[PDB]
Amino acid sequence: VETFAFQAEIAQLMSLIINTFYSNKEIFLRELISNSSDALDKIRYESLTDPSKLDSGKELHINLIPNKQDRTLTIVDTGIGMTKADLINNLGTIAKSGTKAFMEALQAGADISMIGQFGVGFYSAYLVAEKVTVITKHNDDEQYAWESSAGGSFTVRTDTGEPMGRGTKVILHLKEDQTEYLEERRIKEIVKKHSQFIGYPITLFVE
Ligand SMILES: COc1ccc(-c2c(-c3cc(-c4ccc(C)c5ncccc45)c(O)cc3O)noc2NC(C)=O)cc1
């Protein structure tokens, strides 16, 4: 297990997300689904010139899986998946500029729901999760587990859990007062409100 420091700007963003009073938390789901959609777009595009990239799974879709026992909401996609370099360096590098822009926009009257317009929507997960665990698998690379409870650091390890195939699984360990996001009616409502036209099937599992 390797432990890494977030870039200072990203740690600042995470603290803002955790500390700011902001009631419209439900937008976290749209942001995560948007990320899944982007990843699905990419594997779809690449498969057009190299069909063998779908050897790790032809189905392009998103599953939403609530588990009341574990107090988790999991967002699973069969997108392109992330490499170790994505997790440690490259997505953070990209997030720096977006974070800066978002912070500045907030100072000028934007609100937290607009986070995705700055390309850093993943971090909205921390509106509802005390810890986020991300399992990801890119073709020709190993399966990784990324994890953070904020506080300025994250971990990455090679994952020996159940093999995924290809894609990304975001496991939201929900805060004690945010269990509404385990309820079928609530998740359905949010998907219809904010993610109605996503171009991949979204299956909401029930318990
Ligand atoms: C908005 O920027 C991105 C969106 C999706 C992805 C992504 C993902 C993916 C990442 C995330 C994601 C998960 C976890 C973290 C820390 C992320 N940080 C920045 C951007 C995305 C992150 C996710 O929630 C779902 C996803 O399907 N899997 O392969 C990907 N690769 C390509 C080039 O897009 C990467 C960047």
Side-chain angles (χ1 to χ4, degrees):
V1 183
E2 294 179 299
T3 300
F4 302 87
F6 284 112
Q7 295 172 292
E9 294 81 1
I10 301 307
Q12 189 175 20
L13 173 63
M14 292 172 78
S15 292
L16 183 154
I17 290 165
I18 291 162
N19 296 328
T20 301
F21 181 77
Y22 166 79
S23 298
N24 182 213
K25 290 174 178 291
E26 71 190 38
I27 63 92
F28 80 89
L29 186 60
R30 157 192 82 202
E31 300 303 335
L32 294 176
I33 289 174
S34 175
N35 285 358
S36 293
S37 181
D38 290 352
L40 289 157
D41 285 348
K42 194 167 183 180
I43 186 66
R44 181 181 56 188
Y45 174 80
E46 293 192 2
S47 76
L48 293 182
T49 58
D50 187 356
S52 79
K53 283 175 181 182
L54 295 177
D55 284 351
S56 47
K58 288 171 179 178
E59 192 182 358
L60 302 188
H61 71 142
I62 299 170
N63 296 151
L64 307 178
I65 308 178
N67 187 305
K68 292 189 184 181
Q69 168 77 30
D70 305 336
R71 203 205 289 164
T72 56
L73 176 64
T74 300
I75 299 83
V76 183
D77 69 67
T78 49
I80 194 158
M82 289 173 286
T83 63
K84 193 178 186 195
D86 280 335
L87 295 173
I88 294 172
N89 288 314
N90 296 335
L91 298 185
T93 291
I94 292 166
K96 286 239 286 71
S97 54
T99 294
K100 181 181 186 291
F102 179 47
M103 299 289 214
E104 294 169 351
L106 289 172
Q107 298 294 161
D111 68 279
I112 286 165
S113 78
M114 301 167 57
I115 187 172
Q117 300 183 47
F118 302 88
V120 293
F122 168 76
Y123 299 95
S124 73
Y126 291 89
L127 293 169
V128 300
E130 64 187 3
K131 181 170 75 185
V132 181
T133 309
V134 178
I135 314 301
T136 193
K137 174 67 173 71
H138 188 285
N139 289 333
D140 307 317
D141 203 340
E142 297 172 31
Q143 185 162 309
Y144 298 104
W146 176 105
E147 190 168 69
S148 183
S149 296
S153 70
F154 64 95
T155 62
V156 178
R157 62 178 158 88
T158 295
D159 187 35
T160 49
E162 203 276 319
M164 281 177 55
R166 182 199 65 249
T168 299
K169 170 163 51 178
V170 177
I171 306 166
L172 305 174
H173 303 271
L174 298 177
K175 294 181 230 156
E176 194 167 28
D177 61 346
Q178 304 299 144
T179 63
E180 68 189 86
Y181 303 110
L182 303 173
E183 300 288 335
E184 178 177 14
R185 295 187 305 180
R186 182 67 169 121
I187 302 164
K188 274 199 188 125
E189 177 189 44
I190 294 161
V191 169
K192 181 181 179 186
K193 183 184 299 183
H194 293 302
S195 303
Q196 180 177 8
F197 299 119
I198 295 293
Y200 301 96
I202 299 177
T203 301
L204 174 54
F205 286 37
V206 292
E207 278 197 84

Short mmCIF file of all heavy atoms in Angstrom, two decimals, residues 112-134:
data_model
loop_
_atom_site.label_atom_id
_atom_site.label_comp_id
_atom_site.label_asym_id
_atom_site.label_seq_id
_atom_site.Cartn_x
_atom_site.Cartn_y
_atom_site.Cartn_z
N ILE A 112 -21.50 25.24 -5.60
CA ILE A 112 -20.85 23.94 -5.68
C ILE A 112 -21.44 23.02 -6.75
O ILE A 112 -20.73 22.17 -7.29
CB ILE A 112 -20.81 23.27 -4.29
CG1 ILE A 112 -19.76 23.96 -3.41
CG2 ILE A 112 -20.52 21.77 -4.40
CD1 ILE A 112 -19.88 23.65 -1.93
N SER A 113 -22.72 23.19 -7.08
CA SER A 113 -23.33 22.33 -8.10
C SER A 113 -22.68 22.47 -9.48
O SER A 113 -22.84 21.61 -10.34
CB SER A 113 -24.83 22.58 -8.21
OG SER A 113 -25.10 23.75 -8.96
N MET A 114 -21.96 23.57 -9.68
CA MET A 114 -21.35 23.85 -10.97
C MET A 114 -19.98 23.20 -11.13
O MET A 114 -19.30 23.39 -12.13
CB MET A 114 -21.27 25.37 -11.18
CG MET A 114 -22.65 26.00 -11.13
SD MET A 114 -22.64 27.80 -10.98
CE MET A 114 -21.67 28.22 -12.41
N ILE A 115 -19.59 22.40 -10.14
CA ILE A 115 -18.27 21.80 -10.08
C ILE A 115 -17.86 21.05 -11.35
O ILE A 115 -16.70 21.10 -11.76
CB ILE A 115 -18.14 20.88 -8.83
CG1 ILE A 115 -16.70 20.37 -8.67
CG2 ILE A 115 -19.17 19.72 -8.87
CD1 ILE A 115 -16.46 19.62 -7.36
N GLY A 116 -18.81 20.36 -11.97
CA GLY A 116 -18.52 19.60 -13.18
C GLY A 116 -18.12 20.45 -14.38
O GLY A 116 -17.42 19.97 -15.28
N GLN A 117 -18.57 21.70 -14.40
CA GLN A 117 -18.22 22.62 -15.48
C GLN A 117 -16.74 22.97 -15.45
O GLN A 117 -16.22 23.57 -16.39
CB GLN A 117 -19.07 23.89 -15.41
CG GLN A 117 -20.55 23.63 -15.51
CD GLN A 117 -21.38 24.89 -15.51
OE1 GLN A 117 -21.07 25.85 -16.22
NE2 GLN A 117 -22.43 24.91 -14.70
N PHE A 118 -16.06 22.58 -14.37
CA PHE A 118 -14.64 22.84 -14.21
C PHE A 118 -13.80 21.58 -14.26
O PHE A 118 -12.58 21.62 -14.11
CB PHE A 118 -14.40 23.62 -12.90
CG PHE A 118 -15.15 24.91 -12.85
CD1 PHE A 118 -16.45 24.95 -12.37
CD2 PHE A 118 -14.59 26.07 -13.36
CE1 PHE A 118 -17.16 26.14 -12.36
CE2 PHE A 118 -15.30 27.26 -13.34
CZ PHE A 118 -16.59 27.30 -12.85
N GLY A 119 -14.46 20.44 -14.47
CA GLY A 119 -13.78 19.19 -14.74
C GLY A 119 -13.28 18.46 -13.51
O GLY A 119 -12.45 17.56 -13.62
N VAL A 120 -13.79 18.84 -12.34
CA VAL A 120 -13.34 18.23 -11.09
C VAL A 120 -14.51 17.69 -10.26
O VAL A 120 -14.47 17.64 -9.03
CB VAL A 120 -12.46 19.19 -10.25
CG1 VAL A 120 -11.16 19.45 -10.98
CG2 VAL A 120 -13.18 20.50 -9.97
N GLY A 121 -15.54 17.26 -10.97
CA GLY A 121 -16.74 16.75 -10.33
C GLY A 121 -16.55 15.53 -9.44
O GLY A 121 -17.35 15.34 -8.53
N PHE A 122 -15.52 14.73 -9.68
CA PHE A 122 -15.33 13.55 -8.83
C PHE A 122 -15.36 13.93 -7.35
O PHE A 122 -15.92 13.21 -6.53
CB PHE A 122 -14.00 12.86 -9.11
CG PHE A 122 -13.65 11.84 -8.06
CD1 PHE A 122 -14.27 10.61 -8.04
CD2 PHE A 122 -12.71 12.14 -7.08
CE1 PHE A 122 -13.97 9.67 -7.07
CE2 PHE A 122 -12.40 11.21 -6.09
CZ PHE A 122 -13.03 9.98 -6.09
N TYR A 123 -14.75 15.06 -7.01
CA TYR A 123 -14.56 15.40 -5.60
C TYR A 123 -15.85 15.75 -4.88
O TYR A 123 -15.88 15.79 -3.64
CB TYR A 123 -13.48 16.49 -5.43
CG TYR A 123 -12.15 16.01 -5.94
CD1 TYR A 123 -11.74 16.30 -7.23
CD2 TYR A 123 -11.33 15.20 -5.16
CE1 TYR A 123 -10.55 15.82 -7.73
CE2 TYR A 123 -10.13 14.72 -5.65
CZ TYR A 123 -9.75 15.04 -6.94
OH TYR A 123 -8.55 14.58 -7.44
N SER A 124 -16.91 15.97 -5.64
CA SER A 124 -18.24 16.14 -5.06
C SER A 124 -18.70 14.90 -4.30
O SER A 124 -19.63 14.96 -3.50
CB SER A 124 -19.27 16.55 -6.13
OG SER A 124 -19.59 15.46 -6.98
N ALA A 125 -18.03 13.77 -4.55
CA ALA A 125 -18.32 12.56 -3.78
C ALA A 125 -18.23 12.84 -2.29
O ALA A 125 -18.93 12.21 -1.49
CB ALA A 125 -17.35 11.44 -4.16
N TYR A 126 -17.34 13.76 -1.91
CA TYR A 126 -17.10 14.04 -0.50
C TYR A 126 -18.20 14.88 0.16
O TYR A 126 -18.15 15.12 1.36
CB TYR A 126 -15.68 14.60 -0.28
CG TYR A 126 -14.67 13.51 -0.53
CD1 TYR A 126 -14.16 13.29 -1.81
CD2 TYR A 126 -14.29 12.65 0.49
CE1 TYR A 126 -13.27 12.26 -2.05
CE2 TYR A 126 -13.41 11.61 0.25
CZ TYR A 126 -12.90 11.42 -1.02
OH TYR A 126 -12.02 10.39 -1.28
N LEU A 127 -19.20 15.27 -0.62
CA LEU A 127 -20.43 15.85 -0.06
C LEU A 127 -21.20 14.81 0.73
O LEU A 127 -21.90 15.14 1.68
CB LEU A 127 -21.33 16.37 -1.18
CG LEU A 127 -20.81 17.56 -1.98
CD1 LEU A 127 -21.70 17.75 -3.20
CD2 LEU A 127 -20.80 18.83 -1.13
N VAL A 128 -21.08 13.54 0.33
CA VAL A 128 -21.89 12.50 0.95
C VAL A 128 -21.10 11.33 1.52
O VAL A 128 -21.65 10.55 2.30
CB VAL A 128 -22.97 11.94 -0.01
CG1 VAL A 128 -23.92 13.06 -0.46
CG2 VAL A 128 -22.33 11.25 -1.22
N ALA A 129 -19.83 11.19 1.13
CA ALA A 129 -19.02 10.05 1.55
C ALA A 129 -17.92 10.45 2.53
O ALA A 129 -17.24 11.46 2.33
CB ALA A 129 -18.40 9.38 0.33
N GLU A 130 -17.75 9.64 3.58
CA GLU A 130 -16.64 9.83 4.52
C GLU A 130 -15.37 9.22 3.96
O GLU A 130 -14.26 9.62 4.32
CB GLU A 130 -16.98 9.21 5.88
CG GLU A 130 -17.15 7.70 5.85
CD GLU A 130 -17.64 7.13 7.17
OE1 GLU A 130 -17.89 7.91 8.12
OE2 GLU A 130 -17.77 5.89 7.26
N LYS A 131 -15.52 8.23 3.08
CA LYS A 131 -14.40 7.56 2.45
C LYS A 131 -14.86 7.11 1.07
O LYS A 131 -16.02 6.71 0.89
CB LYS A 131 -13.94 6.35 3.28
CG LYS A 131 -12.75 5.60 2.69
CD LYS A 131 -12.17 4.56 3.66
CE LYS A 131 -13.05 3.33 3.76
NZ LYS A 131 -12.50 2.41 4.82
N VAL A 132 -13.96 7.20 0.10
CA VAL A 132 -14.26 6.73 -1.24
C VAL A 132 -13.19 5.73 -1.64
O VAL A 132 -12.00 6.00 -1.47
CB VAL A 132 -14.30 7.88 -2.24
CG1 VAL A 132 -14.63 7.35 -3.64
CG2 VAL A 132 -15.31 8.92 -1.80
N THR A 133 -13.61 4.58 -2.14
CA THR A 133 -12.69 3.55 -2.60
C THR A 133 -12.98 3.36 -4.07
O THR A 133 -14.13 3.21 -4.45
CB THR A 133 -12.94 2.23 -1.85
OG1 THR A 133 -12.94 2.48 -0.44
CG2 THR A 133 -11.88 1.19 -2.20
N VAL A 134 -11.95 3.40 -4.90
CA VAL A 134 -12.13 3.30 -6.34
C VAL A 134 -11.33 2.12 -6.89
O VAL A 134 -10.10 2.09 -6.77
CB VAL A 134 -11.70 4.60 -7.04
CG1 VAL A 134 -11.85 4.48 -8.54
CG2 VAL A 134 -12.51 5.79 -6.51
#
